[PDB]
Design a protein around this motif. Structure first.
Motif, PDB file in Angstrom:
ATOM      1  N   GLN A   1      47.704  36.927  51.475  1.00 18.77           N
ATOM      2  CA  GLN A   1      46.886  37.833  50.667  1.00 18.77           C
ATOM      3  C   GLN A   1      46.085  38.783  51.550  1.00 18.77           C
ATOM      4  OE1 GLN A   1      45.202  37.621  46.592  1.00 18.77           O
ATOM      5  NE2 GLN A   1      46.173  39.406  47.540  1.00 18.77           N
TER       6      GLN A   1
ATOM      7  N   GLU B   1      36.991  33.662  45.669  1.00 24.69           N
ATOM      8  CA  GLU B   1      35.924  34.094  44.774  1.00 24.69           C
ATOM      9  C   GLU B   1      34.941  32.963  44.512  1.00 24.69           C
ATOM     10  OE1 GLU B   1      36.108  37.269  43.991  1.00 24.69           O
ATOM     11  OE2 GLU B   1      34.263  37.393  42.808  1.00 24.69           O
TER      12      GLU B   1
ATOM     13  N   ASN C   1      48.125  45.204  40.214  1.00 26.11           N
ATOM     14  CA  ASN C   1      47.904  43.768  40.257  1.00 26.11           C
ATOM     15  C   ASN C   1      49.014  43.101  39.452  1.00 26.11           C
ATOM     16  OD1 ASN C   1      46.317  41.113  40.376  1.00 26.11           O
ATOM     17  ND2 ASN C   1      44.836  42.564  41.234  1.00 26.11           N
TER      18      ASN C   1
ATOM     19  N   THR D   1      37.416  42.820  42.480  1.00 26.31           N
ATOM     20  CA  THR D   1      38.121  41.958  43.417  1.00 26.31           C
ATOM     21  C   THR D   1      38.977  42.791  44.363  1.00 26.31           C
ATOM     22  OG1 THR D   1      38.182  40.328  41.630  1.00 26.31           O
ATOM     23  CG2 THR D   1      39.528  39.897  43.570  1.00 26.31           C
TER      24      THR D   1
ATOM     25  N   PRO E   1      50.314  40.742  44.276  1.00 25.01           N
ATOM     26  CA  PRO E   1      50.660  39.765  43.238  1.00 25.01           C
ATOM     27  C   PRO E   1      49.553  38.749  43.000  1.00 25.01           C
ATOM     28  CG  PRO E   1      51.765  39.208  45.262  1.00 25.01           C
ATOM     29  CD  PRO E   1      51.087  40.525  45.507  1.00 25.01           C
TER      30      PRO E   1
ATOM     31  N   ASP F   1      48.108  36.043  43.878  1.00 21.82           N
ATOM     32  CA  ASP F   1      47.854  35.071  44.932  1.00 21.82           C
ATOM     33  C   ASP F   1      46.715  34.154  44.507  1.00 21.82           C
ATOM     34  OD1 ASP F   1      49.853  36.177  46.489  1.00 21.82           O
ATOM     35  OD2 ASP F   1      48.480  37.460  47.622  1.00 21.82           O
TER      36      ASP F   1
ATOM     37  N   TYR G   1      46.202  42.768  51.801  1.00 21.45           N
ATOM     38  CA  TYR G   1      45.018  43.609  51.669  1.00 21.45           C
ATOM     39  C   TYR G   1      44.868  44.594  52.828  1.00 21.45           C
ATOM     40  CZ  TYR G   1      43.195  41.565  47.406  1.00 21.45           C
ATOM     41  OH  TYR G   1      43.013  41.193  46.091  1.00 21.45           O
TER      42      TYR G   1
ATOM     43  N   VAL H   1      42.955  34.119  46.062  1.00 23.84           N
ATOM     44  CA  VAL H   1      41.863  35.043  45.773  1.00 23.84           C
ATOM     45  C   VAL H   1      40.829  34.389  44.864  1.00 23.84           C
ATOM     46  CG1 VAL H   1      42.847  36.197  43.735  1.00 23.84           C
ATOM     47  CG2 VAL H   1      41.381  37.466  45.327  1.00 23.84           C
ATOM     48  N   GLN H   2      41.274  33.546  43.927  1.00 28.06           N
ATOM     49  CA  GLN H   2      40.330  32.892  43.026  1.00 28.06           C
ATOM     50  C   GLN H   2      39.479  31.864  43.763  1.00 28.06           C
ATOM     51  OE1 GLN H   2      43.456  31.759  40.530  1.00 28.06           O
ATOM     52  NE2 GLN H   2      43.229  33.440  39.061  1.00 28.06           N
TER      53      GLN H   2
ATOM     54  N   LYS I   1      42.044  48.891  33.428  1.00 27.11           N
ATOM     55  CA  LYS I   1      41.778  47.924  32.374  1.00 27.11           C
ATOM     56  C   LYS I   1      40.689  46.945  32.795  1.00 27.11           C
ATOM     57  CE  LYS I   1      43.392  44.503  29.324  1.00 27.11           C
ATOM     58  NZ  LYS I   1      42.571  45.041  28.209  1.00 27.11           N
ATOM     59  N   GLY I   2      39.831  46.590  31.840  1.00 34.87           N
ATOM     60  CA  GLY I   2      38.815  45.582  32.065  1.00 34.87           C
ATOM     61  C   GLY I   2      39.391  44.217  32.374  1.00 34.87           C
ATOM     62  N   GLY I   3      38.877  43.569  33.418  1.00 34.24           N
ATOM     63  CA  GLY I   3      39.350  42.261  33.810  1.00 34.24           C
ATOM     64  C   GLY I   3      40.638  42.254  34.594  1.00 34.24           C
ATOM     65  N   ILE I   4      41.186  43.425  34.926  1.00 31.66           N
ATOM     66  CA  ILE I   4      42.439  43.486  35.665  1.00 31.66           C
ATOM     67  C   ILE I   4      42.231  43.221  37.147  1.00 31.66           C
ATOM     68  CG2 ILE I   4      42.762  45.846  36.518  1.00 31.66           C
ATOM     69  CD1 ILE I   4      45.039  44.111  33.933  1.00 31.66           C
ATOM     70  N   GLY I   5      40.984  43.081  37.582  1.00 27.08           N
ATOM     71  CA  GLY I   5      40.709  42.782  38.971  1.00 27.08           C
ATOM     72  C   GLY I   5      40.359  44.006  39.785  1.00 27.08           C
ATOM     73  N   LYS I   6      39.400  44.794  39.304  1.00 19.23           N
ATOM     74  CA  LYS I   6      38.962  45.976  40.031  1.00 19.23           C
ATOM     75  C   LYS I   6      38.050  45.591  41.187  1.00 19.23           C
ATOM     76  CE  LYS I   6      38.180  47.947  36.054  1.00 19.23           C
ATOM     77  NZ  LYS I   6      38.023  47.139  34.818  1.00 19.23           N
TER      78      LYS I   6
HETATM   79  N1  ADP Z   1      45.451  39.074  43.500  1.00 16.36           N
HETATM   80  C1  ADP Z   1      44.795  38.136  42.779  1.00 16.36           C
HETATM   81  N2  ADP Z   1      45.130  36.833  42.862  1.00 16.36           N
HETATM   82  C2  ADP Z   1      44.497  35.892  42.145  1.00 16.36           C
HETATM   83  N3  ADP Z   1      43.484  36.158  41.312  1.00 16.36           N
HETATM   84  C3  ADP Z   1      43.043  37.417  41.142  1.00 16.36           C
HETATM   85  C4  ADP Z   1      43.685  38.502  41.879  1.00 16.36           C
HETATM   86  N4  ADP Z   1      43.052  39.631  41.519  1.00 16.36           N
HETATM   87  C5  ADP Z   1      42.085  39.292  40.631  1.00 16.36           C
HETATM   88  N5  ADP Z   1      42.090  37.970  40.407  1.00 16.36           N
HETATM   89  C6  ADP Z   1      41.191  37.204  39.514  1.00 16.36           C
HETATM   90  O1  ADP Z   1      40.980  37.869  38.272  1.00 16.36           O
HETATM   91  C7  ADP Z   1      39.600  38.125  38.046  1.00 16.36           C
HETATM   92  C8  ADP Z   1      39.446  39.600  37.733  1.00 16.36           C
HETATM   93  O2  ADP Z   1      38.075  39.900  37.548  1.00 16.36           O
HETATM   94  P1  ADP Z   1      37.500  41.269  38.127  1.00 16.36           P
HETATM   95  O3  ADP Z   1      37.891  41.364  39.561  1.00 16.36           O
HETATM   96  O4  ADP Z   1      36.059  41.376  37.719  1.00 16.36           O
HETATM   97  O5  ADP Z   1      38.315  42.371  37.309  1.00 16.36           O
HETATM   98  P2  ADP Z   1      37.618  43.725  36.810  1.00 16.36           P
HETATM   99  O6  ADP Z   1      36.671  44.186  37.874  1.00 16.36           O
HETATM  100  O7  ADP Z   1      38.781  44.628  36.524  1.00 16.36           O
HETATM  101  O8  ADP Z   1      36.933  43.233  35.588  1.00 16.36           O
HETATM  102  C9  ADP Z   1      38.844  37.730  39.295  1.00 16.36           C
HETATM  103  O9  ADP Z   1      37.772  36.845  38.963  1.00 16.36           O
HETATM  104  C10 ADP Z   1      39.851  37.053  40.193  1.00 16.36           C
HETATM  105  O10 ADP Z   1      39.567  35.663  40.350  1.00 16.36           O
END
Ligand code: ADP
Ligand code: ICS
Ligand code: CLF
Ligand code: CLF
Ligand code: 0BE
Ligand code: FE
Ligand code: FE
Ligand code: MG
Lengths: 472, 270, 522, 522
Positions: free
Chosen positions: B235, B220, B184, B16, B211, B213, B239, B216-217, B9-14
C-alpha cells in the motif's frame, strides 16, 4: 384605446425579449374576468426597479406590527427591523416601553457565529431577556428573516417550549423575505399564524357577554387614525365594535373576535383568508365596506345597517342626516378648485380601487391605476370602478411608470415614497397614498375633509408653476 | 505552488487517500498543507496524530470574530513537516457549515497562509456539496487542480458525474481544471470497466488506482499513515506511485459531463 | 365632526370629546389593559438603576439598535460613481427598504435594482437571476457601470458573484468590457459602513489590480480623497472647497453629492456627477491617498497600501479645530502647497465664535451616538469647547476604536466623567440618560423617543435631542448641512449654543415664576 | 445655599425654599402689591379685543417701538468704507448706546467716536468740539477718512457741519485734502435706515459732485451695488458670490462684512476691508447703479440719477424666487453676461426644497415685523411658499410702501387675510397676536416678550417666535446667516419648516395623550 396600446408597445420596446413578453402580460387597457386581460401575483423581472417588498414586510410591518401590547422580534440580522421601525403610521394608544411596543425595534442582531452555529439558543435567551425587561407585554411574535428560513432554525419548537415555560403566547411566523414574490404571501403567512396561535385560545370560554349588535373591524391598520375615524360612525349607528385588526389592536380583541355577529372587512387583500376561515369555522358572516368619500361611506353604512334590525337602520339614517351638512360644505368649498383634474395611482393591494369614489366626489377623474401585489380578484373588483379606455399596470417598473406619466401627463399622482420625488422633479403634484403624506385620517366623513384639503394644497400649490427659470 | 482540490463521493476515502498522498509527497522533498471543508473535521487526523479539537470556526466563536483570530493558533505541523489547518463547524442538524467554509477560507486568504514556500495546498471537500460555500476551494485564485476520488461502484461514478456537472460552471468562469479521476476500490467487477470508460467519457483519465488494501484500515486505527506505520508495504508503494502521478499530472481538460442515459447504458456496457 | 374653516388632522382631531369617549369605551371593554397605576409603577421602574443593571446584562436581545446592514453602505458607495447602477444581488424587500431609508433621509430619488431572488433562486442559486438582471438593467437604465452588492440570503448560500458575472459576460448577456465591480456584503457581520468599505475596495480592485505595471506614484500630481460613508452633502462640498482654495489637485472617489442634490427643473435626472472611470483608473498615479474616515476604511487602506503603494497618512477625521489643522497641514506637506490666508481667516473666525460662546458652552453634559469616526470627531470638538461628553455610544464600534477614544478623553480634563460604550443600543442609552442625566443628546432621529420618555418622568428630567447624524427623518433639509472642517465646526457650534439658549428660554418663560431670568441679551 | 459640586446660577437658585419665603415676606410686607386676582383680571383684559381698540387709538404714546434713530444707520454705513472712522457730532451717550447695540448684535467690536458735546457746547456750539475731535481722532486712531453724522441735540441747534469742517481745515486741525464727508442725521425724522441713506448720500456727494466733468457712463464696465442698512453679513457675501459667478464686474459701496467679522488671532484690527475711496470716485463711470433696498435709498437714488446720470433699475429686494430671478435678469441685461448654469442649478435646488416642504408650509399664519424692504421680501417669499401673512407691521414704513405691499398681497390668493400696519409698534402687535392668533411670529429678539405673554394665557395661545431681523440678542451667530438670493431663501425655508416641525413635535410629546402623532418620519 388605440393610443394607450401604442404607448404600451412603445414603452415595452425597451426591455429585452424575455422581459418584453413577461411585461406585456401585466399591462392592459381597462374594459369595464381579469385573467383574460391582465395577470398578477407573478415573479418580478430582475434588475428593473420593482416597488414590491418581501413577505417579512407584509407580515411584520403590516399585520403583526400594529398589534400594540405584543412584542415582535425581527429574528435575524439588524437591517430589516431598522429599516421598518416606525416607518408605517399604524396609530395606537399606549405607553411605549411599558405596555405598547409598536415603534420599538426588537431584534436578535444575528452575527456570523449565529448563522454558522444556529440561533435557537439565542432565541430562547432573547425571549427570557424580553420577559425580564418588558413585564407588561401580553405576547411575543417572532418574525423570521431570510437566513432563518435558509438555515432551518426550529423557531416553532422554541416558541412552544418558552410559551409552556413562561405561560405566554409566542407566535412563530415563517415570513422569510425570499418566500413569495411580494408582501401578499407575508399577509397570508401572518394570517395563518393568527389562526394557528391566537384566534382560538378562547374557543372554550363563554364568559363574554355578546349582544346582537356585535361587529368586528377587519383589516384596518389605523393609518393616521383611519380606523378610529371609521369606528366612531359604526358606534354612532348603535353597533359595538369588539375588535380592530390590527391598527391599535390588542391580542384580547383578536381573541374576542370569534364572538361577533358580523365581520366588516376593509382590506380584502390582507385579511380575506382569516375572514373566510372565521366564516367556515365559527359561522360569522363577513362583508366588505368602503369609507373613502361620502357617497361610498353612505352606501357602506346603509349596507351595514341592512344586516341588522330596524333600530340600526334608523340610527344609520340619523347619522347620515347629521353628517350631511359637513361633507356638503366641504364639497362646496373644495370641488371648484378640483373639478376636471386627472389622477394616476400606484398603491399596494387595496387602495387603488377604494379611493376612486372620494376622487369622484370632488369632480376628479382617475385615468390610470395599478397594484404592486394584488391578485386577480382585486382586478376583477377594480374593473367596474375604472373608466373605459383607461390604463392598468401590474407590478410596474420605474421606467414604465415614468414613461406612462410622461405621455399621459396627469394632474396628480398618488403613490409611494420611492417615486414621490421622482414625479416631483418632473413637475407633477404627488401625494403619498401609503402614509397619507404624514397627514390624515382619510376614512369617514371627518377624513374626507382632510383628503379634500390635502388634494387642494398639493394640486394648486404655486411651487409647481416655478420649475422653469424665466431665462430658459 | 499547486493548489489542488480533492472531491468525490462521501465516504469513498478522500481524507485517507489525501493524507497518505500528502505524506508520500512529504519525505519526498516537498512541502504541503491540508485544508478540510466539512464540519466534522477529521481530514488532518492522520498527519496530526490526533483529532484537532482546534478548528477555525470554534476559535472564531470563542474570540468573537475571525478578525481576532491569529493564524498560529490553528496551523500545526505533523509527519514530514506537513502543515494542517482544520476549520470546522457546527454539530449535525444545526447552523450553516457552508458559511463556515466561506469564512475560514477567507480568513486563510487574509492572514498570510498560502504565501509560504510550500508546494501543494490540498483542499479536501466532503462528499455532499450541498451549497456554494463548499465550492469555495474551486473559486478564482483558489485551487486549480481537481482530483475526483471515486470507486468502481455505480453510485460513486454517479456522484463523480454530478460533481463534474457542478464544477462545469466554475471551470468556464475561471481556470480550475479536472486533473484526473482517482480510483479507490470496493472489490467490484469494474477497475477499468466503468472507470476508464467514465474517465474517457468525461474527457479525462484515471490517474492511478488504489485497491482495497486492508492495511489502510489498521493504520487508521493506529492514528497512522500507511507509509508511517508500514513504510515497506505494498500500500505504501502504491501511495508513492500515486504521489508520483500527482507530481507529473498535465492533463487538465474541462470536464465533459455525460448524461444519465449514458451512465445507464454504460452500466450494462461493462 | 369637521368645520370647513379649520380642518383638523389626526392632531388635534382625536382630542375631541367624541373620540376620547370612543377610545375610553374601546379600552374599557375589549383591550384588557393593565391598570394605569401598574403602568406608572413599571415606567418608574424602567428609569431606575436596578433596571439599568438588568438592561446591561443583555447578551441576546437588541432593542433599538443604532446601525444598519452592509448593502445599504454598498449602495451609497455605488451611487458615488458616474452613471453607476447599484445592483443588490439578493431579495427585493431589501432594496425596497434601502430606497425607502434613503428617500426619507435625503428627500431625493434613489436608484437601486435587485435581481429578486425567490425560493427557487435560493434553492438552485442566482446565476440565471444574475444574467437576466444584468441584461435587463443595462438595457433599461443604460449605466456605464453596474456595482454589485449582496443581500444576506446570497451570502449564506455562497453565491459566487465573480463566477456569475463571468458566466454572464461569456454567454453574451452583457458585453465583456462593460465594467461590473462586485463586493460581498454579508449583513451578519459589521454594519453599513463596512458595506461601504467593501464596495469601495471592490471597485478599486476591479479598476486597478491588473493594470499596475504602468503606474508610478505622484505622476498626476493629485491626492486621492476617500470620504467613506457620508450623508452630509456639505461635507463633500467643504472638502472640495478647502482643497481648491489650497490649490491642491485632488480626486474625490465616490462623490454622490450631485446625484443626491439634483435640481427640480421639470426633468428627472437619474445620474448626476459622480467619480469617473478614468479617475479610478488613474488613481494609483496620485501622490498619496487620504482617508477621511479611517475607522471604517480598513480594507480600503490595506488595498491602497499593499497595491497602490501609497503611504496613507494617519489622519483623524477632519472635524473640529485641531483635526482640521492636522488635515490641512498634512495635505500641505504632501502637495507642497502652503495653506492660504482664506483658511487661516476662517479658522480665526471659528476661534472667535468659540470664545464668544464658551460661557454658555462650558460644562454642559452630552450623550451622543453614531458612526465611529463621526462620534470621535464630535467627542474631540466637544472637548475643545469645554463641554463634557458623558455617554459616548457606538453600536458598530470595536475595541481599538474604544481604546482610541479613551486616549482622546484622557488627554483632556473634560473627559473624566465620560464612558465609551460599544455594542450597546439606544435602550441602553435610555437607561443611561435616566440614571446619569445629561443636558442634551446628540444623535439621529431615533433619539426623539428617548426624549419623550424623559419628558414622561417629568419636565425637570427631560433631555432635549440635537439632530446630528444619520438618519434624520423628522426634520427637513438637514442633510444639506456640514460637519467637516472649520465650516462644519461653526455649524455645530451654532447648533449647540442655540439649543442651550432655546432650552434656557423655555425654562424661564414662566410669568412671575421664572421670568426674572428671561433676559433680552444672552 | 450652594452645593459646590452643582452650583446654581440665578435660575434655578432663586427657586429655592429660602429665597421663595424671603420674596414672599418682602412682597407681603412692603411691596403693597395688588391682589393676584386683580392682576389676572387686568392681564385677561389686555388680551381682549376691547383693549385692541383702546390700543389702536393711540396718538401720543409709543410702547415697545420697532425702530432706532438715524445716527445708528449712519455709523453702520460709515463702517462700510475702508479705514473709515464714524464720528458722531453730538453727545457721548448716543455713541455709547450705538456701540453697545452693535456689539450685542454682532458679538464684535464696533468703532465710533464722539466730540462729547456738553451743556456749554450746547449753548455756544460744537465748532471747537468739532476741531478738537477731528484732530484727536486723526491722531489717535489714524483713519484714512472720517465720516461725520449728528445727534438730535446738534441738529436742533443747527450746527453747520460744512462750516465747522471747513474752518477746521482752514485753521490746520486737519489736512485740507483729508476726506471728511458729513451728513445731517436728525433722530426725530425717519429711522436708522434713513440715517444710512443720508450718510451714503453724503459720502457719494463728497467724492463725486465736483469731479463729474471727466465721467462717462459705462467706461469702467461695472455695476454699482448699494446694499443699504444690512445686518446679515451673509447677504453681502451672497451678493458678491452671485455677481462673481456671473462674471460681472461690480463695486459694492459701503461693504462692512470684513470689519464686522474679524478673525480672532491674538491681535485687534480696528479696520478691515471696506469700500475704497478710488472705488467711490470711479462710481459714476459704472454702467448702472442697483439699489438692493430701494425703499430706504430714496436720496441715494435721486443723487445717482441726477448727478451720475444712471438709469437706476426698478428692482425689488433680491428676496425669494421671483425677485432673485428678476435681479439676475436685470444684471444680465445691464452687463451683457448670460446667467450661468450654476445659478440655474441653485434655483432648481430651491424649487426642489419648496416642493419638498410645501405640505408642512401651506396655510401657516405668520405675523412679522422689521424694516420695509426686508418685510416686503419676506411677505413675497411667504406668498410664494403658500403661507398666509396675517399681520405685516413696519414701524418706519410709509404710505407708498404700504400701497406697494398691498398690491403685492392682492396679486396672490394667499394675501387675502393680510393687513399692513405702518407706524405701529410691538404692543399693537401683541394685541394683534392675541386677538387674531397667527401660527408663528417672525421678527427680532424683542418679540420674545410677546411670546411669553401669549404663553401666560395658555399653551394653546402661545405664538412661537422666529428670529429673523435686527437686532437678535438672545441667540448667537445668527448675523452670519443669509437672507437675499437663493441661499437666503433656502436658509429661511429650512428655518420655517423646522420651526413648524419642532412645534409639532413639542405639541405631541405627551405619552398616552398626544404621542400617537409623534411620528418618526415627517
Ligand atoms: N485503500 C484502502 N484500503 C482499505 N481501506 C480504505 C482504503 N481507502 C479508504 N479506506 C477506508 O474507508 C474509509 C473512508 O473514509 P474517508 O477516508 O473519511 O472517506 P471520505 O473522506 O471520502 O469520507 C476510511 O476510514 C478507511 O478506513
Ligand atoms: S394592508 Fe397592504 S402598500 Fe391592504 S401591504 Fe401596504 S395599510 Fe398599501 S394599498 Mo402601504 S394592501 Fe394596507 C397596504 Fe394596502 S402598508 Fe398599507 S398603504 S390596505
Ligand atoms: S427580503 Fe438581510 S438584513 Fe434585512 S435588509 Fe435584506 S440584506 Fe439587510 Fe430583505 S428585508 Fe429582510 S433581508 Fe429578506 S426579510 Fe425582507
Ligand atoms: S446723550 Fe443720552 S442717549 Fe444720547 S440723545 Fe442724549 S439723552 Fe439720548 Fe437718544 S435719540 Fe439717538 S441716541 Fe442720541 S441721537 Fe437723540
Ligand atoms: Be466524507
Ligand atoms: Fe429633494
Ligand atoms: Fe465675534
Ligand atoms: Mg472526509
Amino acid at each position: 384605446r388605440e393610443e394607450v396600446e401604442s404607448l404600451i408597445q412603445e414603452v415595452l420596446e425597451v426591455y429585452p425579449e424575455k422581459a418584453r413578453k413577461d411585461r406585456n402580460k401585466h399591462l392592459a387597457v381597462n374594459d369595464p374576468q381579469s385573467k383574460k386581460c391582465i395577470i398578477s401575483n407573478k415573479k418580478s423581472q430582475p434588475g428593473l426597479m420593482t416597488i414590491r417588498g418581501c413577505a417579512y414586510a407584509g407580515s411584520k410591518g403590516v399585520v403583526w406590527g400594529p398589534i400594540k401590547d405584543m412584542i415582535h422580534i425581527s429574528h435575524g440580522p439588524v437591517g430589516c427591523g431598522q429599516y421598518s421601525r416606525a416607518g408605517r403610521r399604524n396609530y395606537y394608544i399606549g405607553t411605549t416601553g411599558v405596555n405598547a411596543f409598536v415603534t420599538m425595534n426588537f431584534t436578535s442582531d444575528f452575527q456570523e457565529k449565529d448563522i454558522v452555529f444556529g440561533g435557537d439558543k439565542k432565541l430562547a435567551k432573547l425571549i427570557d431577556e424580553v420577559e425580564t425587561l418588558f413585564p407588561l407585554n401580553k405576547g411575543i411574535s417572532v418574525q423570521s428573516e431570510c437566513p432563518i428560513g435558509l438555515i432551518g432554525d426550529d423557531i416553532e419548537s422554541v416558541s412552544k417550549v418558552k410559551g409552556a415555560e413562561l405561560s405566554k403566547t409566542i407566535v412563530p411566523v415563517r415570513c422569510e423575505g425570499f418566500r413569495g414574490v411580494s408582501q401578499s404571501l407575508g399577509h397570508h403567512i401572518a394570517n395563518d399564524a393568527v389562526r394557528d396561535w391566537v384566534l382560538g385560545k378562547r374557543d372554550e370560554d363563554t364568559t363574554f357577554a355578546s349582544t346582537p349588535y356585535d361587529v368586528a373591524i377587519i383589516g384596518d391598520y389605523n393609518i393616521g387614525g383611519d380606523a378610529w375615524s371609521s369606528r366612531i360612525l359604526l358606534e354612532e349607528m348603535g353597533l359595538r365594535c369588539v375588535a380592530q385588526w390590527s391598527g391599535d389592536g390588542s391580542i384580547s380583541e383578536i381573541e374576542l373576535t370569534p364572538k361577533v355577529k358580523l365581520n366588516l372587512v376593509h382590506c380584502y387583500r390582507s385579511m380575506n383568508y382569516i375572514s373566510r376561515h372565521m366564516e367556515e369555522k365559527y359561522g360569522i358572516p363577513w362583508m366588505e365596506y368602503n369609507f373613502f368619500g361620502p357617497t361610498k361611506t353612505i352606501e357602506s353604512l346603509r349596507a351595514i345597517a341592512a344586516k341588522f334590525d330596524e333600530s340600526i337602520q334608523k340610527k344609520c339614517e340619523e347619522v347620515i342626516a347629521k353628517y350631511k351638512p359637513e361633507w356638503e360644505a366641504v364639497v362646496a368649498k373644495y370641488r371648484p378648485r378640483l373639478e376636471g383634474k386627472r389622477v394616476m395611482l400606484y398603491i399596494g393591494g387595496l387602495r387603488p380601487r377604494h379611493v376612486i369614489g372620494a376622487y369622484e366626489d370632488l369632480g376628479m377623474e382617475v385615468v390610470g391605476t395599478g397594484y404592486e401585489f394584488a391578485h386577480n380578484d382585486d382586478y376583477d373588483r377594480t374593473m367596474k370602478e375604472m373608466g373605459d379606455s383607461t390604463l392598468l399596470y401590474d407590478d410596474v417598473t420605474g421606467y414604465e411608470f415614468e414613461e406612462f406619466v410622461k405621455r399621459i401627463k396627469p394632474d396628480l399622482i398618488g403613490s409611494g415614497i420611492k417615486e414621490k420625488f421622482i414625479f416631483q422633479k418632473m413637475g407633477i403634484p404627488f401625494r403619498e397614498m401609503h402614509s397619507w403624506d404624514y397627514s390624515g385620517p382619510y376614512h369617514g366623513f371627518d377624513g374626507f375633509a382632510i383628503f379634500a384639503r390635502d388634494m387642494d394644497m398639493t394640486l394648486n400649490n404655486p411651487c409647481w408653476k416655478k420649475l422653469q427659470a424665466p431665462w430658459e | 505552488m499547486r493548489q489542488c482540490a480533492i472531491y468525490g463521493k462521501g465516504g469513498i476515502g478522500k481524507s485517507t487517500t489525501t493524507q497518505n498522498l500528502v505524506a508520500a509527497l512529504a519525505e519526498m522533498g516537498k512541502k504541503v498543507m491540508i485544508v478540510g471543508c466539512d464540519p466534522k473535521a477529521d481530514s488532518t487526523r492522520l498527519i496530526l496524530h490526533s483529532k484537532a479539537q482546534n478548528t477555525i470556526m470554534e476559535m472564531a466563536a470563542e474570540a468573537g470574530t475571525v478578525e481576532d483570530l491569529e493564524l498560529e493558533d490553528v496551523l500545526k505541523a505533523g509527519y514530514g513537516g506537513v502543515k494542517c489547518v482544520e476549520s470546522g463547524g457546527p454539530e449535525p442538524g444545526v447552523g450553516c457549515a457552508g458559511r463556515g467554509v466561506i469564512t475560514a477560507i477567507n480568513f486563510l486568504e487574509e492572514e498570510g497562509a498560502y504565501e509560504d514556500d510550500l508546494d501543494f495546498v490540498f483542499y479536501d471537500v466532503l462528499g455532499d456539496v450541498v451549497c456554494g460555500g463548499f465550492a469555495m476551494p474551486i473559486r478564482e485564485n483558489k485551487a486549480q487542480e481537481i482530483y475526483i476520488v471515486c470507486s468502481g461502484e455505480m453510485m460513486a461514478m454517479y456522484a463523480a458525474n454530478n460533481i463534474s456537472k457542478g464544477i462545469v460552471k466554475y471551470a468556464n468562469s475561471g481556470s480550475v481544471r479536472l486533473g484526473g479521476l482517482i480510483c479507490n476500490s470496493r472489490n467490484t467487477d469494474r477497475e477499468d470497466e466503468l472507470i476508464i470508460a467514465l474517465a474517457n467519457k468525461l474527457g479525462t483519465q484515471m490517474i492511478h488506482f488504489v485497491p482495497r488494501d486492508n492495511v489502510v484500515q489498521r493504520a487508521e486505527i493506529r492514528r497512522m499513515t500507511v507509509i508511517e506505520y508500514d513504510p515497506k508495504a505494498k500500500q505504501a508503494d502504491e501511495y508513492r506511485a500515486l504521489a508520483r502521478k500527482v507530481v507529473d499530472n498535465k492533463l487538465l481538460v474541462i470536464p465533459n459531463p455525460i448524461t444519465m442515459d449514458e451512465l445507464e447504458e454504460l452500466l450494462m456496457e461493462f | 365632526s369637521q368645520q370647513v374653516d379649520k380642518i383638523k388632522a389626526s392632531y388635534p382631531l382625536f382630542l375631541d370629546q367624541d373620540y376620547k369617549d370612543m377610545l375610553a369605551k374601546k379600552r374599557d371593554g375589549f383591550e384588557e389593559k393593565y391598570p394605569q397605576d401598574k403602568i406608572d409603577e413599571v415606567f418608574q421602574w424602567t428609569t431606575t438603576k436596578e433596571y439599568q443593571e438588568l438592561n446591561f446584562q443583555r447578551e441576546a436581545l437588541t432593542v433599538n439598535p443604532a446601525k444598519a446592514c452592509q448593502p445599504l453602505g454598498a449602495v451609497l458607495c455605488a451611487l458615488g460613481f458616474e452613471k453607476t447602477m447599484p445592483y443588490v444581488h439578493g431579495s427585493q424587500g431589501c432594496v425596497a427598504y434601502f430606497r425607502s431609508y434613503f428617500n426619507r433621509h435625503f428627500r431625493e430619488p434613489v436608484s437601486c435594482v435587485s435581481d429578486s431572488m425567490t425560493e427557487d433562486a435560493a434553492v438552485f442559486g442566482g446565476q440565471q437571476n444574475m444574467k437576466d438582471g444584468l441584461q435587463n438593467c443595462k438595457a433599461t437604465y443604460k449605466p456605464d457601470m453596474i456595482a454589485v452588492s449582496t443581500t444576506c440570503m446570497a451570502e449564506v448560500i455562497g453565491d459566487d458573484l465573480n463566477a456569475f458575472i463571468n458566466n454572464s459576460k461569456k454567454e453574451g448577456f452583457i458585453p465583456d468590457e462593460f465594467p461590473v465591480p462586485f463586493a460581498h456584503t454579508p449583513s451578519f457581520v459589521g454594519s453599513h459602513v463596512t458595506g461601504w468599505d467593501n464596495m469601495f475596495e471592490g471597485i478599486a480592485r476591479y479598476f486597478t489590480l491588473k493594470s499596475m505595471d504602468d503606474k508610478v506614484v505622484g505622476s498626476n500630481k493629485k491626492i486621492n480623497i476617500v470620504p467613506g460613508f457620508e450623508t452630509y452633502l456639505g461635507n463633500f462640498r467643504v472638502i472640495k472647497r478647502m482643497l481648491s482654495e489650497m490649490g491642491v489637485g485632488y480626486s474625490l472617489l465616490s462623490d454622490p453629492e450631485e446625484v443626491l442634490d439634483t435640481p427640480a427643473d421639470g426633468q428627472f435626472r437619474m445620474y448626476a456627477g459622480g467619480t469617473t472611470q478614468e479617475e479610478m483608473k488613474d488613481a494609483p498615479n496620485a501622490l498619496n491617498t487620504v482617508l477621511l474616515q479611517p475607522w471604517h476604511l480598513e480594507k480600503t487602506k490595506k488595498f491602497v497600501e499593499g497595491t497602490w503603494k501609497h503611504e496613507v497618512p494617519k489622519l483623524n477625521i477632519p472635524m473640529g479645530l485641531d483635526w482640521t489643522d492636522e488635515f490641512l497641514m498634512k495635505v500641505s506637506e504632501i502637495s507642497g502647497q502652503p495653506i492660504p490666508a482664506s483658511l487661516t481667516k476662517e479658522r480665526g473666525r471659528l476661534v472667535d465664535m468659540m470664545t464668544d460662546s464658551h460661557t454658555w458652552l462650558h460644562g454642559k453634559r452630552f450623550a451622543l451616538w453614531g458612526d465611529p469616526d463621526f462620534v470621535m470627531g464630535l467627542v474631540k470638538f466637544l472637548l475643545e469647547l469645554g463641554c463634557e461628553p458623558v455617554h459616548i455610544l457606538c453600536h458598530n464600534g470595536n475595541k481599538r476604536w474604544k481604546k482610541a477614544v479613551d486616549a482622546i478623553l484622557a488627554a483632556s480634563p473634560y473627559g473624566k466623567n465620560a464612558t465609551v460604550y460599544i455594542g450597546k443600543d439606544l435602550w441602553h442609552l435610555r437607561s443611561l440618560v435616566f440614571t446619569d442625566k445629561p443636558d442634551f443628546m446628540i444623535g439621529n432621529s431615533y433619539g426623539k423617543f428617548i426624549q419623550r420618555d424623559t419628558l414622561h418622568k417629568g419636565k425637570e428630567f427631560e433631555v432635549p435631542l440635537i439632530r446630528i447624524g444619520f438618519p434624520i427623518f423628522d426634520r427637513h433639509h438637514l442633510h444639506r448641512s456640514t460637519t467637516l472642517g472649520y465650516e462644519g465646526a461653526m455649524q455645530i457650534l451654532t447648533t449647540l449654543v442655540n439649543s442651550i439658549l432655546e432650552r434656557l428660554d423655555e425654562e424661564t418663560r414662566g410669568m412671575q415664576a421664572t421670568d426674572y431670568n428671561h433676559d433680552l441679551v444672552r
